[PDB]
Amino acid sequence: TRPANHRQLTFEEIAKSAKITVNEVELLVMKALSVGLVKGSIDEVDKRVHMTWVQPRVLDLQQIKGMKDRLEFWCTDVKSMEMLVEHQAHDILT
Amino acid sequence: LGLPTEAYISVEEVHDDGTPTSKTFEHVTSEIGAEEAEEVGVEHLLRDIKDTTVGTLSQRITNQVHGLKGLNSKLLDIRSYLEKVATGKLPINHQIIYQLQDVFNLLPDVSLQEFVKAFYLKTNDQMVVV
Amino acid sequence: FDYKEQLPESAYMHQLLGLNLLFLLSQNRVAEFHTELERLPAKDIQTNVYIKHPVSLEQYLMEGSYNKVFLAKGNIPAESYTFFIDILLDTIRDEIAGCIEKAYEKILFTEATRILFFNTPKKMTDYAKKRGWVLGPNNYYSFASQQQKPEDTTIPSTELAKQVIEYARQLEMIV
């Protein structure tokens, strides 16, 4: 559910979501990394857990629609950058 | 945009994920190589429409533009398939789809402060040489 | 100025020049103030009172002797001077409100009123309305929204790409 940019997870949020005590989140995240379900890193000073998730998940039609519009934004950005580069380098393009 | 070959193979499996199995056609990576004689023939044939070998800035910028165009085409194809899946015209694979999800997870995530500082350092280090 | 070589010069000439200097100072056209002041011969810069008063007030405003300006407001030699002195006081008040704006990161109503020289809290409230200074939770006007630290987080990306493409253009151009 994270916006894929604020991938850092606060320890309080994980404690509330999983109903695990403050100190249990460390072990829970460690197990998640160990079994092979997440490929991130864990920080204790800030009590935030770095998230880099490789294990995929099944999708839903609404999830597919969200992914589709996000990819539409991505492709529009790519097209805009390509057009800018092409127009700015017309002489050198050849 | 793309190679002119697409090698396919026949695969019979049980599909694991409780779905009917069929002959289908599994895909295998394809690439166009050559041997010495064929290479010599190709070089002779395309000696009048061949770009100079060496990274001339013109060819580098043109290649980068070509790569942007290829990325745009691939993204458009993926978006069209996603639209078809959402509208139901094509089935939700339940596989490969999460491969696209993994792709979307592997995004660079630029604008991180540490990465921004490092990239500015690299850009300045290159600009001093320039 | 053009016809000094024949036409006579009256003390009214000093008075009008001083009034013009005061007007320019009040309208914050300091550059035009000095441009005009250069015209007057250096002898009357300090001798004539009518031009010395605007010059003195501008000099006081230069070094932030704002209390000096307010106290010396009584050196006005003419009522026409007093009108533009009131206008200049308003301009100095605006500049002081800024001064609290840009330099300070936070302020307080009790001290802000003294800084801006308001004898009634209603005037400071009017400034909060006219200039829209965001009040603070502890009655501390907040200016943090002014300075900010933009552009230090996102790489321009596109602009530097344009610059590098310009480099490549200037390189591969036949000319």
Interchain proximity A72–B99, CB inside 8 Å:
no
Task: Give the contacts of C109 (CB within 8 A, at least 6 positions apart).
Answer: C121, C124, C135, C139, C140, C141
Q: How far is residue B117 from each of residues A60, B100, C97, measured CA to CA in Å?
A: 38, 30, 37
Q: How far is residue C13's CA from residue B121's CA, in Å, rounded to a whole number?
A: 64
Beta-ladder partners of B7: B28
Please report, for residues A39, A69, B93, B97, C44, the alpha-carbon distance to residue B81 in angstroms, rounded to integers and kept in the order given: 29, 12, 11, 10, 85
Query: Which chain A residues touch B98 with a CB distance below 8 Å?
Result: 56-59
CA gap B111, B105 in Å, rounded: 16
Spell out the residues 6+ positions from residue A42 whose beta carbon is closer than 8 angstroms to its own: A26, A29, A30, A33, A49, A50
Helices C109-116 & C121-130, crossing angle to 10 degrees? 90
What own/partner pairs with CB < 8 Å and gap ≥ 24 does B85-88 have?
B85/A64, B86/A61, B86/A64, B86/A65, B86/A68
How many residue pairs bridge chain A and chain B with CB atoms within 8 Å of each other? Answer: 77
Residue partners of C135: CB distance under 8 A and separation at least 6: C109, C128, C141, C142
- Chain C CB contacts of A85 under 8 Å are 161, 165
**B26 three-state secondary structure:** strand
Where in B1-130 does DSSP place strands (E)? 7-9, 26-28
The β-bridge partners of A10 are: A48
Chain C residues with CB-CB distance to A88 below 8 A: 161-162, 165-166
Give the length of chain B.
130
* Interatomic CA distance for residues A80 and A28, integer angstroms: 43
Contact predicate B21/B13, CB 8 Å: yes
The tokens of B112 are what? 């991180």
Q: What is the CA radius of gyration of chain B?
A: 22
User: Smallest Cβ distance to C154: which of B61, B111, B123?
Assistant: B111
Contact C48, C14 (CB under 8 A): yes
Which residues in chain C have Cβ-Cβ distances shorter than 8 Å to B56?
172
Q: Helix C79-102 and helix C11-26: axis angle, to 10°?
A: 20
Nearest-CA distance B42 → chain A (Å): 23
Tokens of B89: 């015209």
Q: Say if CB B97 and CB A59 are below 8 A apart.
A: yes
**Whether B61 and C165 lie within 8 Å, measured CB to CB:** yes
Helix axes C11-26, C30-39, angle to 10 degrees: 160
Closest CA to A93 of C125, B51, C85: B51
Whole-angstrom CA distances from C42 to C50, C52, C56, C75 are 14, 11, 14, 22
Strands A41-42 and A48-50: antiparallel
Rounded CA-CA distance A9/A48 in Å is 5
| B120 and C155 Cβ atoms separated by less than 8 Å | yes
Residue A75 · residue B75 · CB < 8 Å: yes
In 10 A of CB C127, how many CB atoms? 19
Q: How far is CA A36 from CA A31, C129, C165, in A?
A: 9, 60, 44
Q: Could you tell me which of C10, C4, C12, C1 has the C-alpha nearest to residue C36?
A: C1
List of E strands, A1-94: 9-10, 41-42, 48-50
- Show which of residues 34-73 on chain B sit within 8 Å of chain A, judged by CB atoms: 57-58, 61-62, 64-65, 68-69, 71-72
Chain C adjacent subunits, 3+ CB pairs under 8 A: A, B
Q: Does any CB of chain B come closer than 8 Å to the CB of residue A68?
A: yes
| Closest residue by Cα to residue C97 from C119, C73, C114 | C114
**Searching chain B, which residue's CA lies closest to the CA of residue C167?**
B130
Q: What is the 3-state secondary structure (H, E, C) of chain C?
A: CCCCCCCCCCHHHHHHHHHHHHHHHHCCCHHHHHHHHHHCCHHHHHCCHHHHHHHHHHHHHHCCCHHHHHHHHHHCCCHHHHHHHHHHHHHHHHHHHHHHHHCCCECCHHHHHHHHCCCCHHHHHHHHHHCCCCCCCCCCCECHHHHCCCCCCCCCCHHHHHHHHHHHHHHHCCC
| Structural contact between residues B98 and A58, judged by C-beta atoms closer than 8 angstroms | yes
Q: Is B39 helix (H, G, I), strand (E, B) or coil?
A: helix
Q: Output the 3-class SS for B98-115.
A: HHHHHHHHCCCCCCCHHH
- Partners of residue B27 on adjacent β-strands: B8
- Based on its alpha-carbon atoms, the radius of gyration of chain A, rounded to whole angstroms, reads 20
Radius of gyration of chain C (CA): 24
What are the backbone angles phi and psi of residue A89, rounded to the nearest 5°?
-120, 40
Q: Which two tokens stand for residue A36?
A: 């092979």
Distances (CA, A) of C63 to C9, C59, C68: 33, 7, 10
Sorted by sequence, the CB contacts under 8 Å of residue C95 that are 6+ apart come out as: C28, C61
Other C-beta atoms lying within 10 Å of the C-beta of residue A23: 9
Count how many residues are written for chain C: 175
What residue segments make up the domains of chain C, in order of their start?
1-170
Residues in Cβ contact with C66 at an 8 Å cutoff, skipping those fewer than 6 apart: C60, C92, C96, C117
How many other β-carbons are positioned within 10 Å of the β-carbon of residue C46?
A: 11
Could you give the C-alpha distances from B12 to A55, B16, B21, B22, B26, in angstroms and in order?
26, 12, 7, 6, 9
Distance, in Å, from the CA atom of B15 to the CA atom of B38, rounded to the nearest integer, reads 42
**C141 and C133 in contact (C-beta within 8 Å)?**
yes
Q: Does B61 touch chain C (CB under 8 A)?
A: yes
User: Does A81 sit within 8 Å of C165, measured CB to CB?
Assistant: no
Indicate the SS3 state at residue B28. Answer: strand
Cβ within 8 Å, pair B98-A57: yes
Question: How far, in Å, CA of C112 to CA of C97, rounded?
Answer: 8
Identify the sign of the CA torsion B122, B123, B124, B127: positive
Experimental determination technique: cryo-EM
Buried b (16+ CB within 10 A) or exposed e, C9-20: eeeeebbebbbb
Q: Rounded distance, CA B98 to CA C22, Å? A: 75
